[PDB]
Amino acid sequence: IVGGYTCGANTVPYQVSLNSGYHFCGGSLINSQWVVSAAHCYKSGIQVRLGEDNINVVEGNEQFISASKSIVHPSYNSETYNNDIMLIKLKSAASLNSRVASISLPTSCASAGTQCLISGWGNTKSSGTSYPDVLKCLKAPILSDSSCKSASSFIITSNMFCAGYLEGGKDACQGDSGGPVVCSGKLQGIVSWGSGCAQKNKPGFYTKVCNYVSWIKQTIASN
Numbered sequence: 001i002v003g004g005y006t007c008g009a010n011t012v013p014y015q016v017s018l019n020s021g022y023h024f025c026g027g028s029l030i031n032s033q034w035v036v037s038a039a040h041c042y043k044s045g046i047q048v049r050l051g052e053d054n055i056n057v058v059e060g061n062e063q064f065i066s067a068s069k070s071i072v073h074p075s076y077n078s079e080t081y082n083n084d085i086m087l088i089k090l091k092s093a094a095s096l097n098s099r100v101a102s103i104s105l106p107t108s109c110a111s112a113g114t115q116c117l118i119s120g121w122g123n124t125k126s127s128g129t130s131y132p133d134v135l136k137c138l139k140a141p142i143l144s145d146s147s148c149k150s151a152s153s154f155i156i157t158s159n160m161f162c163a164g165y166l167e168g169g170k171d172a173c174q175g176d177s178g179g180p181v182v183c184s185g186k187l188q189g190i191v192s193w194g195s196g197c198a199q200k201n202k203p204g205f206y207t208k209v210c211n212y213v214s215w216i217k218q219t220i221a222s223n
């Protein structure tokens with residue numbers, strides 16, 4: 001997260017860190033057994049880390065639970081990033097509390113101009129790199145489809161939306177992928193892709209979670 005602020009320990013209690021020996025992606029806890037993340041974050045040997053603030057220090061509220069199964073969306077296209085969504089089942093149920101809490105799935109799609117919360121342990125610089133130990137947060141509005149279209153050379157699908165600031169300086173970045181975009185108190189986005197971070201006229205793109213609720217509900221009903 002570039003241009004954001006220190007969230008504060010456990011103020012975003014649905015935020016997970018995905019760890020394969022090191023933090024590599026975020027995710028969102030949607031119930032005691034399931035995490036939503038980006039398909040492009042798929043890898044084997046995922047440990048899900050809940051209750052995290054400083055990812056390098058055991059602070060006392062962590063739960064570390066191994067993934068038992070990962071399910072990349074059936075139509076995930078790595079070429080275009082279309083359907084950039086994945087479900088991770090936990091080997092054992094998380095103990096839900098004030099610091100480890102689930103986020104609801106939306107029942108409708110968020111509207112243009114809505115201010116959302118984006119969070120993660122990604123790079124905090126637009127040029128070069130610096131990786132935080134504590135969770136960073138960014139408030140950012142969903143941008144109109146027409147404005148997102150002209151803000152990328154790539155082709156955008158209706159399973160994606162963009163959010164952020166065309167003036168630059170405020171964006172998600174490398175290492176935030178998979179993490180939550182929360183609007184109206186529900187999970188509306190997944191950190192998906194971008195061109196650099198916090199560059200002028202290059203806002204972030206996000207998986208439009210509202211389009212996936214049926215598939216998520218079906219899948220967790222049977223796994």
Ligand SMILES: COC(=O)[C@H](Cc1cccc(C(=N)N)c1)NC(=O)CNS(=O)(=O)c1ccc(C)cc1
Nearest residue numbers: 171172173174177192193194195196197198204205
């Ligand atoms: C990996 O390098 C990066 O710094 C960002 C990370 C990132 C990830 C998710 C969201 C954001 C964001 N800004 N909101 C940033 N991605 C890139 O910069 C990738 N862009 S890119 O132009 O380098 C590129 C384009 C197409 C392919 C196939 C590979 C790489």
Ligand SMILES: [Ca+2]
Nearest residue numbers: 054057058059
């Ligand atoms: Ca910790």
